[PDB]
């Protein structure tokens, strides 16, 4: 599996602040801006919702969380995202075994605290809730980030 440079970018971005005075661990959007910047990947800017609108319009869209975990393993940056009536959420999907045989592991910051957060050990199906977990979108960038 080739996701290590993504994971590493994730680890490094975790302590950064894409916004002045706001550690990425508390800013889901900011957190992926830094992950993307450390990997030379252009990423639509804005809050979570605006980022999802941008992914929708310009990135490849995958079918399952399964397919998302494969693209991570292949060395590709994958974003799991889902708008909200008010605020959305985005996360970086990484390779490894699907939780409940369906939801891939991820990294994501969150203004909600630990229960909105993940350092590689919580699947998307443990960040998003029972209802939202099955409604996620998965976007993969068009060129690999990891050799």
Active site residues: 28, 89
Give kind and range of the element (H or E) at residue 107.
Answer: strand 105-108
Task: Name the token pair of 31.
Answer: 């957190």
Residue position matching structure tokens 């910051």? 109
Read off the tokens for 109. 């910051």
DSSP label of 97: P
- Give the Cβ contact number of residue 120 at 10 Å: 16
Q: Which two tokens stand for residue 84?
A: 């909200």
Please calculate the CA angle 122-100-9 and round it to the nearest 5 degrees. Answer: 30
Task: Count other Cβ atoms within 10 Å, centred on residue 2.
Answer: 15
């Amino acid at each position: 599996s080739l996701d290590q440079c993504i994971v590493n970018a994730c680890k490094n971005s975790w302590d950064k602040s894409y916004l002045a005075g706001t550690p990425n661990k508390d800013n889901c959007s900011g957190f992926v801006q830094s992950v993307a910047a450390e990997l030379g990947v252009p990423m639509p800017r804005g809050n979570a919702n605006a980022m999802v609108d941008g992914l929708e319009q310009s990135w490849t869209k995958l079918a399952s969380g399964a397919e998302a975990a494969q693209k991570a393993a292949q060395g590709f940056l994958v974003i799991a995202g889902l708008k909200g009536r008010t605020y959305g959420h985005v996360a970086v999907v990484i390779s490894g075994p699907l939780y409940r045989q369906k939801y891939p592991m991820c990294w994501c910051g969150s203004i909600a605290g630990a229960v909105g957060q993940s350092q590689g050990l919580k699947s998307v199906g443990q960040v998003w809730n029972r209802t939202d977990r099955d409604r996620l979108n998965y976007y993969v960038y068009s060129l690999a980030s990891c050799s």
